[PDB]
Design a protein around this ligand. Sequence first.
Ligand SMILES: *[C@@H]1O[C@H](CO)[C@@H](O[C@@H]2O[C@H](CO)[C@@H](O[C@H]3O[C@H](CO)[C@@H](O)[C@H](O)[C@@H]3O)[C@H](O)[C@H]2NC(C)=O)[C@H](O)[C@H]1NC(C)=O
Ligand SMILES: *[C@@H]1O[C@H](CO)[C@@H](O[C@@H]2O[C@H](CO)[C@@H](O[C@H]3O[C@H](CO)[C@@H](O)[C@H](O)[C@@H]3O)[C@H](O)[C@H]2NC(C)=O)[C@H](O)[C@H]1NC(C)=O
Ligand SMILES: *[C@@H]1O[C@H](CO)[C@@H](O[C@@H]2O[C@H](CO)[C@@H](O[C@H]3O[C@H](CO)[C@@H](O)[C@H](O)[C@@H]3O)[C@H](O)[C@H]2NC(C)=O)[C@H](O)[C@H]1NC(C)=O
Ligand SMILES: *[C@@H]1O[C@H](CO)[C@@H](O[C@@H]2O[C@H](CO)[C@@H](O)[C@H](O)[C@H]2NC(C)=O)[C@H](O)[C@H]1NC(C)=O
Ligand SMILES: *[C@@H]1O[C@H](CO)[C@@H](O[C@@H]2O[C@H](CO)[C@@H](O)[C@H](O)[C@H]2NC(C)=O)[C@H](O)[C@H]1NC(C)=O
Ligand SMILES: *[C@@H]1O[C@H](CO)[C@@H](O[C@@H]2O[C@H](CO)[C@@H](O)[C@H](O)[C@H]2NC(C)=O)[C@H](O)[C@H]1NC(C)=O
Ligand SMILES: *[C@@H]1O[C@H](CO)[C@@H](O)[C@H](O)[C@H]1NC(C)=O
Ligand SMILES: *[C@@H]1O[C@H](CO)[C@@H](O)[C@H](O)[C@H]1NC(C)=O
Ligand SMILES: *[C@@H]1O[C@H](CO)[C@@H](O)[C@H](O)[C@H]1NC(C)=O
Ligand SMILES: *[C@@H]1O[C@H](CO)[C@@H](O)[C@H](O)[C@H]1NC(C)=O
Ligand SMILES: *[C@@H]1O[C@H](CO)[C@@H](O)[C@H](O)[C@H]1NC(C)=O
Lengths: 249, 97, 31, 379, 49
Amino acid sequence: QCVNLTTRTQLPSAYTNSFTRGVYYPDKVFRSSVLHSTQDLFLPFFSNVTWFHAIKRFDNPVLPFNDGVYFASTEKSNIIRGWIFGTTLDSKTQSLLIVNNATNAVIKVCEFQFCNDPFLGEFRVYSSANNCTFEYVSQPFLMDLEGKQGNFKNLREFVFKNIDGYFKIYSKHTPINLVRDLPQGFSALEPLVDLPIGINITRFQTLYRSYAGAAAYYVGYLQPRTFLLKYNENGTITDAVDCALDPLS
Amino acid sequence: KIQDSLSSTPSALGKLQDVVNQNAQALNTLVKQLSSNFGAISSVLNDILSRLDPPEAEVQIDRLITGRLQSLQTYVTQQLIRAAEIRASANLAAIKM
Amino acid sequence: QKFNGLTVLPPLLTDEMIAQYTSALLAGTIT
Amino acid sequence: ETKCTLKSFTVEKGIYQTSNFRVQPTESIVRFPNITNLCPFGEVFNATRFASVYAWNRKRISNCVADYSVLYNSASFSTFKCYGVSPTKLNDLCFTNVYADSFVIRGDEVRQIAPGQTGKIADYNYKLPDDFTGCVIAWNSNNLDSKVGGNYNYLYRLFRKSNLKPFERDISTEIYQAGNTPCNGVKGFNCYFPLQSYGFQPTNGVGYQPYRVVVLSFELLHAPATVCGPKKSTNLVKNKCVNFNFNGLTGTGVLTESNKKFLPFQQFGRDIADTTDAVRDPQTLEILDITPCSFGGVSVITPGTNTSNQVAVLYQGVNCTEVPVAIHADQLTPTWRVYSTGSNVFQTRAGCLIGAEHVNNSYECDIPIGAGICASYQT
Amino acid sequence: VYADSFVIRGDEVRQIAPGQTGKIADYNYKLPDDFTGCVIAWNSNNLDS
Ligand SMILES: *[C@@H]1O[C@H](CO)[C@@H](O[C@@H]2O[C@H](CO)[C@@H](O[C@H]3O[C@H](CO)[C@@H](O)[C@H](O)[C@@H]3O)[C@H](O)[C@H]2NC(C)=O)[C@H](O)[C@H]1NC(C)=O
Ligand SMILES: *[C@@H]1O[C@H](CO)[C@@H](O[C@@H]2O[C@H](CO)[C@@H](O[C@H]3O[C@H](CO)[C@@H](O)[C@H](O)[C@@H]3O)[C@H](O)[C@H]2NC(C)=O)[C@H](O)[C@H]1NC(C)=O
Ligand SMILES: *[C@@H]1O[C@H](CO)[C@@H](O[C@@H]2O[C@H](CO)[C@@H](O[C@H]3O[C@H](CO)[C@@H](O)[C@H](O)[C@@H]3O)[C@H](O)[C@H]2NC(C)=O)[C@H](O)[C@H]1NC(C)=O
Ligand SMILES: *[C@@H]1O[C@H](CO)[C@@H](O[C@@H]2O[C@H](CO)[C@@H](O)[C@H](O)[C@H]2NC(C)=O)[C@H](O)[C@H]1NC(C)=O
Ligand SMILES: *[C@@H]1O[C@H](CO)[C@@H](O[C@@H]2O[C@H](CO)[C@@H](O)[C@H](O)[C@H]2NC(C)=O)[C@H](O)[C@H]1NC(C)=O
Ligand SMILES: *[C@@H]1O[C@H](CO)[C@@H](O[C@@H]2O[C@H](CO)[C@@H](O)[C@H](O)[C@H]2NC(C)=O)[C@H](O)[C@H]1NC(C)=O
Ligand SMILES: *[C@@H]1O[C@H](CO)[C@@H](O)[C@H](O)[C@H]1NC(C)=O
Ligand SMILES: *[C@@H]1O[C@H](CO)[C@@H](O)[C@H](O)[C@H]1NC(C)=O
Ligand SMILES: *[C@@H]1O[C@H](CO)[C@@H](O)[C@H](O)[C@H]1NC(C)=O
Ligand SMILES: *[C@@H]1O[C@H](CO)[C@@H](O)[C@H](O)[C@H]1NC(C)=O
Ligand SMILES: *[C@@H]1O[C@H](CO)[C@@H](O)[C@H](O)[C@H]1NC(C)=O
């Protein structure tokens, strides 16, 4: 099933500043009261991250993964549903699929024939699933956070890396109460799962299953750099400073 | 006045604070040096012992032995130089006394 | 530090005895 | 000890350092996860038909118990070269994730399977990473996969614009424009199909024969490993320094109830020296700390050798409530132990002095010990 | 000069080197870790088959 609707609905693409976001737990090691430094792919702070907002009707744009992509979500009622992965997206080359449908999240990597305008309401994301090499099912990932009834908005930061054939996912939940901008503060990400894709992916798109709600995201471009992490005495990240933002850093 | 001045600023006792800090920093780096690979496949001897058969295990240990021995020599030489300056200051203090 | 074989040793002259030296010196001077 | 250290048969009056003292471990403790089902390594090694080298299959194996001895002892394998791993300690050591990569190649390209080499399949459809760890297993299978008319289901990728990433798998069949002019359709002049077909027949000689290969891509000990061999678990004991074993973490030290809170993806706690400092039991979800049990230096206090041969002993930095536990039942680095007889014992800030008598008369410091205490050989 | 003579398979020749692992090596014939000397080997099928 596919219906191709209208156009890209103008250009709401703007810019916003990423104050202190874009860091995940680098490794599966517990450390305390140590200012550890890691040299790997992370989002720099104050990065001129691309901004979008679902102010109606809207579409999902196609963006690269040069040295991978940091993704963040400012969401309510869990509009976010996953992402689209691929390099050619025309079933000539293998592209990966993630959809968090009503039952649970399912991840499937095949030579999918992605539709020109994938939207949900309906599972209209692809027309063909010809040749497959991976298929996985689990329990749904829509873990709504504490407080309930959406008193504070949900921040669900995300990192998706493709290193030497390994696809890594990290996750975090935290409530936010800033109306439009990035909440001032620090956070990190819990690693979730490593995925064996081994396929060349250059560009992504998003899902946004459709239904009186609004939500916006950021795009951060992950880059290989050095960052200093301030672990507390409990083993959770409490502050961070760039090694390559300004002379003071 | 002297008691008041000594009770006020901390920049006066830098001479002794540095004597403490240099030793602390050097020994701290000496500890840190145990985490490096020195060209091996692991920084933990137990792992290199547990993995591999007896012959190759020792070969990787040698790389580790050479690196750690070099680190020890560097630390000892720096300590020897530091001790000489501490003794030069001690002779000056004795003459002043 | 101590767990890897890095051990610190105590000085021979304790601080109380060093204080005894300095007190004796200045008392002898002033008297 | 003093004479042997001085490498001479006369010893002058003074305090002499000798070999360090360290408490030896008493018993062995091994703690592996108590999963029981066997890993279906037969389902990969004896699988009916593998995929082509251009489309090599990847299977994940977990939640089971393996046995690599039956693989190393099998003479069928022609080449068995391992990287940072040995089959001897495989039924012991643990594994984060076990992934079986299965494919078929020609005998000449077997050398290309190792990381770092190059070739028509190495640079095009299967390359191992620069820092690859694992072990590759290969052996001829002509009698298993060859047909008199020719086996044509096996193909490899011949032309690509740029070399692939590690473990990359390219399935696209785009026609390669070997010529400068663009082309389309099924084929064209100087426009080859990217895949090239093999001609395996029983008449071929060695080197050109098909070699069935199976590879593992495991990673070790930087994650909460889940699979390892049939090594059986024992019980744990506390407050005694022993050579424990948690999921292949060989070590030695006294284990005590810790208080740190590992995240579910965290299994190990590391110190400044990048050494493990706390451990979680792979059978119950509590967390324990590891400390190296008591050790220290030994110094021997003696007067002039010609004057006498009686000596005392001092342990630097050792609280001598331990040395009663340092009974000569288990192993100890210093063999001599008769001096712990007792009532000739005294405690200093510098350690515990054993074999000397404490008095109140003060004298000039003859032999300096530490913290203001001085010993002397006197009537 | 001590001459140790014995016959094995073609594929198990690799085990004759010191420090090697295999059935023959582990069960009946291992050379010392610091072995000095050397082995001489050749096929003898047309003599002992
Ligand atoms: C969300 O996506 C899921 C995967 O994309 C999808 O899972 C699908 O579940 C159905 C029913 O469980 C499966 O259909 C088969 O179910 C059993 C499995 O043994 C068979 O006996 C049946 O005869 C039937 O063939 C689908 O196979 C499975 N999808 C895939 C790709 O395997 C969920 O249903 C989706 N949820 C919603 C609400 O759309
Ligand atoms: C590290 O985690 C610790 C446990 O989660 C946490 O300790 C907790 O600290 C709070 C406040 O610091 C305590 O709450 C009580 O604190 C004092 C008593 O010390 C009372 O006057 C307060 O009114 C309040 O009742 C918790 O009792 C305490 N819990 C535990 C188990 O220690 C630390 O604060 C955390 N440290 C960091 C740097 O994040
Ligand atoms: C993963 O997919 C990428 C996208 O296809 C691919 O990058 C592409 O590489 C080809 C060949 O290297 C380029 O083709 C052009 O190459 C040179 C420039 O170096 C031109 O002069 C030629 O005329 C030719 O048109 C593509 O331009 C390039 N595309 C992009 C978006 O980068 C990667 O190489 C793939 N990764 C691997 C490991 O194969
Ligand atoms: C997706 O949108 C495209 C618009 O580019 C639609 O393509 C046209 O489809 C009609 C048939 O309904 C053809 O007559 C046109 O020639 C097509 N245009 C082009 C440029 O190919 C397409 O129909 C839409 N998808 C679906 C499922 O309707
Ligand atoms: C990808 O899918 C295509 C479509 O089915 C496969 O092409 C078929 O392959 C079979 C088996 O070789 C042939 O019998 C068919 O004739 C092919 N279809 C066509 C239209 O030619 C292809 O094999 C698949 N590729 C992989 C790697 O699985
Ligand atoms: C040497 O060790 C003993 C015991 O191992 C220490 O004695 C402890 O002293 C504290 C404080 O006086 C008491 O709370 C403990 O109960 C004592 N232990 C026992 C087993 O009774 C002794 O203090 C240590 N020496 C030094 C210099 O610290
Ligand atoms: C971000 O980029 C936009 C245009 O790309 C520019 O207008 C804006 O000033 C930039 N902001 C920062 C903080 O660099
Ligand atoms: C494959 O089968 C043979 C006999 O059928 C058996 O000896 C061998 O052990 C099997 N492979 C594995 C990995 O067990
Ligand atoms: C190990 O055994 C205990 C009791 O025998 C059981 O409670 C536990 O679940 C077992 N471990 C696992 C990982 O299932
Ligand atoms: C030790 O005593 C002997 C006599 O018993 C004497 O010959 C020797 O010189 C003495 N050693 C020293 C160093 O004085
Ligand atoms: C030294 O004198 C004290 C009295 O203050 C006494 O308790 C102690 O036993 C004396 N020392 C010895 C070795 O008897």
